[PDB]
Design a protein around this ligand. Structure first.
Ligand SMILES: NC(=O)C1=CN([C@@H]2O[C@H](COP(=O)(O)OP(=O)(O)OC[C@H]3O[C@@H](n4cnc5c(N)ncnc54)[C@H](O)[C@@H]3O)[C@@H](O)[C@H]2O)C=CC1
Ligand SMILES: NC(=O)C1=CN([C@@H]2O[C@H](COP(=O)(O)OP(=O)(O)OC[C@H]3O[C@@H](n4cnc5c(N)ncnc54)[C@H](O)[C@@H]3O)[C@@H](O)[C@H]2O)C=CC1
Ligand SMILES: NC(=O)C1=CN([C@@H]2O[C@H](COP(=O)(O)OP(=O)(O)OC[C@H]3O[C@@H](n4cnc5c(N)ncnc54)[C@H](O)[C@@H]3O)[C@@H](O)[C@H]2O)C=CC1
Ligand SMILES: NC(=O)C1=CN([C@@H]2O[C@H](COP(=O)(O)OP(=O)(O)OC[C@H]3O[C@@H](n4cnc5c(N)ncnc54)[C@H](O)[C@@H]3O)[C@@H](O)[C@H]2O)C=CC1
Ligand SMILES: O=C1O[C@@](c2ccccc2)(c2ccccc2O)CC(O)=C1Sc1ccccc1Cl
Ligand SMILES: O=C1O[C@@](c2ccccc2)(c2ccccc2O)CC(O)=C1Sc1ccccc1Cl
Ligand SMILES: O=C1O[C@@](c2ccccc2)(c2ccccc2O)CC(O)=C1Sc1ccccc1Cl
Lengths: 323, 324, 327, 325
């Protein structure tokens, strides 16, 4: 008899289908930061990693596996084949390369049907850029209802904003509230009316808030949200830690059915004079069914016009794509 | 009056110093894995990063800072000057290259260590840079620290890997699979078969051939896999980072929280196993707010003692020729 | 339009089911400690509480709900009716007034006759974790009444005993209890068995270093450590009336392994028929692998002649009580 | 050679001061709920309990200690003597007993407790939970001689938490994402600041201008009324409140011990605000960190809201001027 059988008496061998499984597709800097953040937050009982570069993928899996003693996620698997992803509650897409969008669309033509085949009832969380467009692409390819296709969107943009606000005020970002909505990245919209500490509106105290003529230049806090991201790419070549942590925050709400509100990208047709199938960030209630509800933010005329212009721009791109 | 003043009435401006500061030196793959793991474990009120590559350092600092909303570490700083590391409780050294390998990290350490001791004379030093056992001795020699405050990550990771592999073979979580890999980090590490157990049941007693060539289940290969899988991971992804980062954060937890948990880390073993030279090797150590306060005297077979002694002679052979 | 509808646009109203639901039956000191520990470890997406005292039950429910801001368990419910417990992954029984032993058995069997079928009705596929005393007898009872397979009926058993043991060992050694290993097995409480051969720090056997360990000839009286496990328990009851915090922490650790499918090894009470010459349907603590199917495997500990005699004696007594129980 | 000496070689005996020590004074339901929550949040490296009931104190201590395997707080101590509390960063006071006697009786308790705490932990922060919390925070401040930054009253921290729970139930949103502030005097006279109530920075009052008035169709005023009715109801049903206060207190402790500078509604000396010029303590949003309350947020209040706080300050000072120290 084996040492195992001498030591251990087995009551049953039967294995359940995974109960709280997460898949991350793409094991680059973003994918792996999402993975480590998810693992240290105990969100999943099974983590699957998928990529096309097989050696890298295997090496990343093993490195995580070698840390198992320090974790509470007992099964970590990987493969090029999407059979390793079967029965995921949440599938996080971080893989990626008008040229660039279409190149990512082509990636998504392979990835998305494979995800759907093995986890037809999963929530999809899209991180790959440009995120708002590619969330739309994942929605179209998957055939999923809009509640189950979520884009990382402006979650990171808002986190950066709150970090910068906190620095200026001498307050932890958790107590510094403020929302950056619309299109992720360059064209995002800081909603000055919602910016507050303890329910005290900064805009009400300081009407120049968010205007060019502001003596304290509070507009620069949003400009530095965009300038931050370029600076990080310049200095280190890529962003990973902040995005990883932000994605894990979204995963927590979904896997634990928290119904917290996050600025994420959702299908926004029917609001703000937007009449096309575009995804943009608004505050959304996140839970076990993905996005169940959204907050209807009262926007100024200028805020509305910025969202509409993004919508037109995104749609101008999307209508040209071949699936 | 600014908006800040309009919003916030200041009671006092009495500026403070951190109570639980940790410094990571070197922001490569290992350093940043240590940092993120330490950050997600809430071990520090201030994290300081140091490196010689200025753009990389600034950019990694910023990247962590940008995830502040999701953390409970209110200040992350970085700098080339070791004034940013002042009054660190714990300083983790992960800088250096991944006979020549040793002398070059020694040269790095001649710059780093005096600078650390200058600004944080009461810190615990935790050495990760390879070869970790040698560089722990080097840090101890240069710092002048008492041996309790100079700790090498040593075989904490090797033992973690062993327990992972043991667990896969037995179908038990690594937490519940007990087994110690001691001595030199890397090729010459020693699996202590006599200590291997689940629920206090000795596997060697149940399976006398455990760890010998006669073993039909080839358990000896589990230790071989521990030695190898590091090479395997370097071949596949170019480096190791996550496992070491997790293991360093586990050590940091015991130090920062004064837990007095036992970990296999590299310490001065002169006086044990017939070893007379000032060499660092891994034995199980009690880790707390004063670093290594105590060590466990593992009872080793003659073969096991001979193996540690051989390592001590080898390491000393390299160390006697190093120039400080 | 209402304020809610002005503020919030609903995408869908599909009402789904909880994914990681835990029920605690009996909201006394033990049950509520279990509850707070489980809440603070983020093990559940829904917590249900059941008791027969309706006001106490509601107040406890409300008091936990009021701390929701500080937790990540979005739904806490309670009621006398078992419909609140539907679709639980794990149901923890801490019901029955605290404590002769046979009369304790008698009254807690009667309670179980009502509780267990209602639990099974609403959560046929749950794992049952029995804490109520005498825990070994009541684990048998839950298994008999429920009809569940052996893997899904777990008794808290010697989990607390072993934790107390490890605390005391750590105090004598100046080492954290996590790094002090040792197993108290067999019957929970007065008749538990400390397995001297397994006691170790860093794989170093204390018994090998110190052959008199656990014997009357031991000059350092290490046998008092196990005796103090027993004495500790009586002393806490004398001092504050009951045990709550330690048992609650110990139960949350078991829940952790089960909910997260960890396959960690814990000393818990399981059907031991087939080991140690025991041929009756008795539950006693051995080391068990715990995960999402409950107890999937158990460790076969080598016991001394004496240690084995004590388990065998316990098994004989327990079966003596159990064979006369009427179902 | 003992077994310990055979197993373990000692490098140094030099034990240090505990670095992250918390004391809880009073081991009733509140105190112990604070204790367990602090332990499960890994905020301290040493916890000390004090009470005047000696058997209960030892038993609670031992019961916590027996859970040590599942915690990361390596030293739990207790005693009637305040020497067990030495070098605490933070001392939480939950000890406490017509109803104007009640105040003087808790003052009498504080006359004994506070000087002992100060003697052994001169640099601590004081966190007062005992009721009536606003008066008793003033009392602790007065007896201790501490700067105002180091005497913190639990105040409306629990009130606000209940409010956010209730708001969250009404909207179907997690309380974390439901923002709203209950300020002023803890308990029956607290003030809900309707102007600040929001989800995602979207003011409820702007959407629904009648919010919190008697003309309000939906009577959101009920949420605040329910905040007070809830606390009476919990007492009526289980005899005391424990779990929610324990959790809210651990949250305050987390900000202080980790120097987070988060903003919490806690009781601080509000002299010089809202037309108040007496030495009284009322809840406003405060920044909490390693030196306690360093800063407060100047909430824009309506005249009605300022008037309510003024009346509270007047009533509180009325009682305080009659107290015997
Ligand atoms: N929405 C946000 O806020 C953030 C978005 N992103 C995006 O994340 C994406 C990736 O970022 P990095 O990790 O830095 O890139 P990376 O280039 O380092 O890694 C990308 C990975 O995608 C994999 N991949 C490519 N084709 C694939 C396929 N057909 N199936 C599976 N995997 C495939 C690659 O092999 C590679 O491992 C980019 O689109 C980037 O813009 C990055 C940061 C922030
Ligand atoms: N003890 C263990 O179990 C493990 C040990 N290690 C070791 O960790 C070390 C680093 O590994 P990686 O992070 O992968 O290397 P890396 O090349 O990615 O990063 C090393 C960093 O050290 C910095 N550095 C060099 N000289 C410096 C100086 N004088 N002052 C400050 N910073 C300086 C470099 O600029 C670089 O950023 C290597 O020695 C490697 O062997 C790696 C993994 C596991
Ligand atoms: N196995 C172990 O290591 C430990 C076991 N235990 C046991 O846990 C049990 C509970 O202890 P305490 O909380 O201190 O008792 P308790 O008297 O404080 O609470 C018991 C609760 O059960 C409720 N209850 C009674 N009948 C019920 C029914 N038919 N259905 C639902 N609930 C019912 C009571 O109303 C009460 O709320 C006891 O049996 C005690 O011995 C306690 C400590 C350690
Ligand atoms: N600010 C808030 O939101 C909350 C305020 N509180 C207050 O907490 C206090 C205690 O509440 P409970 O634990 O339920 O009452 P409790 O009566 O059960 O416990 C009070 C403890 O204080 C002890 N004590 C009395 N005098 C003492 C002294 N001189 N030194 C040390 N200990 C002493 C008692 O022995 C007792 O153990 C009360 O004032 C209560 O009103 C309670 C709930 C919420
Ligand atoms: O920070 C980011 O990094 C990337 C980026 C994209 C476009 C412009 C700047 C940066 C990037 C570029 C190259 C390689 C890796 C990367 O992650 C990708 C990306 O979406 C972000 S977030 C961001 C970007 C621009 C403005 C504001 C924000 Cl908050
Ligand atoms: O600590 C415990 O408390 C109780 C007990 C039972 C029998 C003998 C002593 C104590 C108890 C009695 C009355 C009221 C409430 C209680 O929890 C119940 C119980 O099982 C334990 S654990 C225990 C008991 C005896 C020896 C060793 C151990 Cl580890
Ligand atoms: O909830 C509480 O409980 C107590 C209370 C005091 C006065 C009126 C109701 C309750 C209480 C009474 C008796 C015994 C123990 C107790 O904890 C003490 C107390 O301050 C609270 S909190 C509270 C109280 C009243 C209104 C709004 C709030 Cl948020």
């Amino acid at each position: 008899a084996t040492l195992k059988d001498q030591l251990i008496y087995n009551l049953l061998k039967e294995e359940q289908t995974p109960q709280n499984k997460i898949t991350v597709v793409g094991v680059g800097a973003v994918g792996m930061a999402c993975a480590i953040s998810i693992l240290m937050k105990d969100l999943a009982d099974e983590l699957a990693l998928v990529d096309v570069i097989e050696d890298k993928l295997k090496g990343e899996m093993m490195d995580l596996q070698h840390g198992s003693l320090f974790l509470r996620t007992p099964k970590i698997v990987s493969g090029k084949d999407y059979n390793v992803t079967a029965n995921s509650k949440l599938v996080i897409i971080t893989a990626g390369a008008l040229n660039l969008v279409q190149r990512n669309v082509n990636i998504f033509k392979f990835i998305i049907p494979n995800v759907v085949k093995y986890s037809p009832n999963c929530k999809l969380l899209i991180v790959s850029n440009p995120v708002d467009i590619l969330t739309y692409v994942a929605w179209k390819i998957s055939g999923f209802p809009k509640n189950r296709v979520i884009g990382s969107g402006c979650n990171l943009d808002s986190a950066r904003f709150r970090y910068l606000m906190g620095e200026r005020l001498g307050v932890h970002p958790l107590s510094c509230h403020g929302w950056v909505l619309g299109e992720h990245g360059d064209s995002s919209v800081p909603v000055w009316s919602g910016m507050n500490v303890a329910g005290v509106s900064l805009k009400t105290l300081h009407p120049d808030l968010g205007t060019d003529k502001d003596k304290e230049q509070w507009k620069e806090v949003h400009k530095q949200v965009v300038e931050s991201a370029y600076e990080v790419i310049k200095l280190k070549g890529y962003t990973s830690w902040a995005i990883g942590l932000s994605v894990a925050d979204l995963a927590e709400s979904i896997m634990k059915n928290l119904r917290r509100v996050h600025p994420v990208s959702t299908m926004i047709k029917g609001l703000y004079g937007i009449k096309d199938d575009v995804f943009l960030s608004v505050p959304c209630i996140l839970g076990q069914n993905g996005i169940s509800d959204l907050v209807k933010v009262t926007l100024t005329s200028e805020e509305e016009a910025r969202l509409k212009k993004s919508a037109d721009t995104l749609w101008g791109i999307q209508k040209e794509l071949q699936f």
